Nucleic acid binder design. Structure first.
Lengths: 262, 149, 141, 151, 129
RNA sequence: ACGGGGAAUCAGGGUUCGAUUCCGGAGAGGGAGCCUGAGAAACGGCUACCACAUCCAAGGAAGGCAGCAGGCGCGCAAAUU
RNA sequence: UUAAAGUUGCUGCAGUUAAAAAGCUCGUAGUUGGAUCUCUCUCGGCCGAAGCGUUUACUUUGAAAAAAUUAGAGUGUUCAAAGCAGGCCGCCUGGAUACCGCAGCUAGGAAUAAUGGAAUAGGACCGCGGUUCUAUUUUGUUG
């Protein structure tokens, strides 16, 4: 290739998008933006494929160009815009607010929130540095550059951002005993309390996380997102509450449902 | 069987189960070592000292009496020689076979036996150089060998 | 016997490599001399032009005349002998005709009484010999 | 000068040698302050680098190179070309049809610093990955351990 | 020369029981031999045995009860993972109702069923049925 | 001989195939050199040479289907301008 | 072209007479190699943070491993190959899971197999002394 690529094939698209084989040869290639190509949900696959407000890709454009969808408080008319983890989608015409939160199976969930909860979001801390004339600067997982933060905030922490002003209202440090969600790997979508962190200098750290039912797993430190302080999350949680059911337990829980029906 | 021969003989020594000195032998360890020093100064190898002691003084084993071996005793006193005795006797035989071989050029069989002897010499030299008994630069010279003997 | 160590894989693999060349099927397939000597060049069928009609006398104890044809191959100019299979099927072939020729069943070996013949005729002038023999099609005019 | 055997004056770029202080400083002693760093992955800087006077820019402790990547180990095979050595790595490769192994080796050229003196070709050396230092050199010696015949 | 003394131990026991003998002498003794013999004995295949001290590699006298069909060694000591044990026991054992493969694992010298109970692999020493 | 993901066969081990719609590489008749641009040594860009080949008032001008159809050729062997 | 072919044989073939052990011995690389040996010093509020135990091979575990394909769960395409849909009278519900050599990373085990740890004692552990460089606490601060 002599330059950057502009297409995406449907079998090469991220599996959690849940795209079928026989609709087309191509998939929406996400625009460049705050979230990565393989860790985002474009607006077309959310308005058309998940919410079914539109039947074709031309109808998504007609909804978008009417300026109905706000991503974290700003109107986006791009139909392949890379929305991602912890983002807030607001449709004012129907009065709906959604937050992009992984479910236990590793896929983005349709998680509706209240108008009050849509006024803030939680952001991980990626980089801290000092810029010209000694001004501290943050860089988050949302590609947000926030200057003059508290000196107690360090890398791998979580901050709360008010979407109207874009300023930090509170923060949670990274330490054992704090709630977290896994945002990658094989435990994606799982919620649990940090119990240990083993350090491997010159390589990747490992964090051990225990569920509410007593199941323990481990992840790389880059795949951990601190949610709340202690056992209490700072955001509303999806239906599964982060607990991964086994296939036998899931089978029994599904079979018990149809017996209830009658 | 034999290294360089097709023989398969079985003759050897059989140590008794008793590791203990018998009561009729009244020689103390220090007196046993004194004979070792005495016979070491008459040009006797450790294996010669052992047979002399066995045949004359009733000393079946010195490891059983003094709790040490003859070569270790000699080395502790400083009476061990430069080359080990087994390698010394192999080089002596190589010089004798090679000395017979200039007056006898048509002796094709001594020429075979000398090859076997020098192969055995090289085997022992390799073993001793791995053990840091001989310096790493030691090398057996077929012509300079008489200087070692 | 054979070596049986844990660090013997190189010995085992090299010995197998060397000893596979003593298998004549393997050598014939993998050496390349049997591919250059094959008139078809690795193909199952080939087309050619008829030069002459020949008759090959059968090997003993059989006594007959197998009716063949001499054919020059179009793609390389090589010359072969091809047997005309059924009863009276030589009467359908004429000189300077273009014929389709196939192997004769044994992968480059002669078959039966017919000595030194490895090929057989399938089609004459784009008409199969079976259709001509059973009276389904006739020679073009 | 032993330290100045090349056509260009050899110095540590971080160090300034022309601080005109006082006549007494000239009278007292002329010993340059030396730049040494802590190449750190649990490794320790040898004291022959803090007290030495050699000038070499591809040394890890007193030069401009960074150690990141892979940490490996090998046996010194040859010390012939200037200031770099050749080491050998021996490993077993698994052939799964026969369920067995075979011995293979790799020859790897590494840079040897003057802070590692009295090193012979029999001994184990730890090496760390760095940037390309020449056509076929990417590793640098980080620790020297004597061989079986240790004195 | 004598390599794999356990092979000689197991070939001597097999050859004597073909002749209908009641006792066999094994030399030299070794602790791998003793552990293998104990594994065979706890399953009822040989019976009580006894070690003779020689101030050397001792020897063993083993009583034979006529219940042994075969006891053999596998050379070399192949590494066996817990997922590759079924193939080995299909290849080596005469039935799924009797016979044992003897392995050495970090938990000790055992048979293929105790290894499955303890969830561990190892290196294959031999077999008996 | 483009490399993998993979395909056929198959008690267990194994043998053979993978030009081919997904990922990576390479090329645009053969070599070479460039301009523009964030990105090309680009060929549905330019400049030469080598091999072919087009119109001509003989002065000159213009070329690149291993893109979709289609034609010739080659073949045992492959579809609608 | 695969099986048949235990006629390429690692599993698993043959070499007295059917094809076949070098005339014989030495010898480097390669391959193989006899017994033997039963976790803790500082810190943060009885535990963790930090050192390794000689080093490995081996075994179990963990995370990291594109989708499609393959194995496999659910689902009357009218059945099936398929597909990822669908079900109830606006609601309910899926789009699982397994496998993914070798090499690299991680944490338990210590049988089997290599490897080292004191023999000019330049040995371990304890208290004792001397030579040199040197810590920048203390003289409310500054020399």
């Amino acid at each position: 290739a002599r330059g950057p690529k502009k297409h995406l094939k449907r079998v090469a698209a991220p599996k959690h998008w849940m795209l079928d084989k026989l609709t087309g040869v191509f998939a929406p290639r996400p625009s460049t933006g705050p979230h990565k190509l393989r860790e985002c949900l474009p607006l077309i696959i959310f308005l058309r494929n998940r919410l079914k407000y539109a039947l074709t890709g031309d109808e998504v454009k007609k909804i978008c160009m009417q300026r109905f969808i706000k991503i974290d408080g700003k109107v986006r008319t791009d139909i392949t815009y890379p929305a991602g983890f912890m983002d807030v989608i607001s449709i004012d015409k129907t009065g709906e607010n959604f937050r992009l939160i992984y479910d236990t199976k590793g896929r983005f969930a349709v998680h509706r929130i209240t108008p009050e909860e849509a006024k803030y979001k939680l952001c991980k801390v990626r980089k801290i540095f000092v810029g010209t004339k000694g001004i501290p600067h943050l860089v988050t997982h949302d590609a947000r550059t926030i200057r003059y933060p508290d000196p107690l905030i360090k890398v791998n922490d979580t901050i709360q951002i008010d979407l109207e002003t874009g300023k930090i209202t509170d923060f949670i440090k990274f330490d054992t005993g704090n709630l977290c969600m896994v945002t990658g790997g094989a435990n994606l979508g799982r919620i649990g309390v940090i119990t240990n962190r083993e350090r491997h200098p010159g390589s990747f750290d490992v964090v051990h996380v225990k569920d509410a039912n007593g199941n323990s797993f481990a992840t790389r430190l880059s795949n951990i997102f601190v949610i709340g302080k202690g056992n209490k999350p700072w955001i509303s949680l999806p239906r599964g509450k982060g607990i991964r059911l086994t296939i036998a337990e899931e089978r029994d829980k599904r079979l018990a449902a149809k017996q209830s029906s009658g | 069987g034999r290294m360089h021969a097709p023989g398969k003989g079985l003759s050897q020594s059989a140590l008794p189960y008793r590791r203990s000195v018998p009561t009729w032998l009244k020689l103390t360890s220090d007196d046993v070592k004194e004979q070792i020093y005495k016979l070491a100064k008459k040009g006797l190898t450790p294996s010669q000292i052992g047979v002399i002691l066995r045949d004359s003084h009733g000393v079946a084993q010195v490891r059983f009496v003094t709790g040490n071996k003859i070569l270790r005793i000699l080395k502790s006193k400083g009476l061990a020689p430069d080359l080990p005795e087994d390698l010394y006797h192999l080089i002596k035989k190589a010089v004798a076979v090679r000395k017979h071989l200039e007056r006898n050029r048509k002796d094709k069989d001594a020429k075979f036996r000398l090859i076997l002897i020098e192969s055995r010499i090289h085997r022992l030299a390799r073993y001793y150089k791995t053990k840091r008994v001989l310096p790493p630069n030691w090398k057996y010279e077929s012509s300079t060998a008489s200087a070692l003997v | 016997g054979k070596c049986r160590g844990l660090r013997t894989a190189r010995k085992l693999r090299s010995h197998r490599r060397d000893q596979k060349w003593h298998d004549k099927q393997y050598k014939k397939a993998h050496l390349g001399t049997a591919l250059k000597a094959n008139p078809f060049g690795g193909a199952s069928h080939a087309k050619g032009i008829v030069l002459e009609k020949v008759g090959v006398e059968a090997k003993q104890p059989n006594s007959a005349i197998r009716k063949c044809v001499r054919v020059q191959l179009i793609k390389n100019g090589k010359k072969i002998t091809a047997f005309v299979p059924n009863d009276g099927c030589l009467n359908f072939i004429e000189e300077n005709d273009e014929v389709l020729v196939a192997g004769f069943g044994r992968k480059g070996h002669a078959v039966g009484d017919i000595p030194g013949v490895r090929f057989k005729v399938v089609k004459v002038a784009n008409v199969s010999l079976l259709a001509l023999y059973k009276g389904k099609k006739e020679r073009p005019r | 000068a032993d330290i100045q055997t090349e056509r260009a004056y050899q110095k540590q770029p971080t160090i300034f040698q022309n601080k005109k202080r006082v006549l007494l400083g000239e009278t007292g002693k002329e010993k340059l302050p030396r730049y040494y760093k802590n190449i750190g992955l649990g490794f320790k800087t040898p004291k022959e680098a803090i007290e030495g006077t050699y000038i070499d820019k591809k040394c890890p402790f007193t030069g401009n190179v960074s150690i990141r990547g892979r940490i490996l180990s090998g046996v010194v095979t040859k010390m012939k070309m200037q200031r770099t050595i050749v080491i050998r790595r021996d490993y077993l490769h698994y052939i799964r049809k026969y369920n067995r192994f075979e011995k293979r080796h790799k020859n790897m050229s590494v840079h040897l610093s003057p802070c590692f003196r009295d090193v012979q070709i029999g001994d184990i050396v730890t090496v760390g990955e760095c940037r390309p230092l020449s056509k076929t050199v990417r590793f640098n010696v980080l620790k020297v351990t004597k061989a079986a015949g240790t004195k | 020369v004598r390599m794999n003394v356990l092979a000689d131990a197991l070939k001597s026991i097999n050859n004597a029981e073909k002749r209908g003998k009641r006792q066999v002498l094994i030399r030299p003794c070794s602790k791998v031999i003793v552990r293998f013999l104990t594994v065979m004995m706890k399953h009822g295949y040989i019976g009580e045995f006894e070690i003779i001290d020689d101030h050397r590699a001792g020897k063993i006298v083993v009583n034979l009860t006529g219940r042994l069909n075969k006891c053999g060694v596998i050379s070399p000591r192949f590494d066996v993972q817990l997922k590759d044990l079924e193939k080995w026991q299909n290849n080596l054992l005469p039935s799924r109702q009797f016979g044992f493969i003897v392995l050495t694992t970090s938990a000790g010298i055992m048979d293929h069923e105790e290894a499955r109970r303890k969830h561990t692999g190892g290196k294959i020493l031999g077999f008996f049925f």
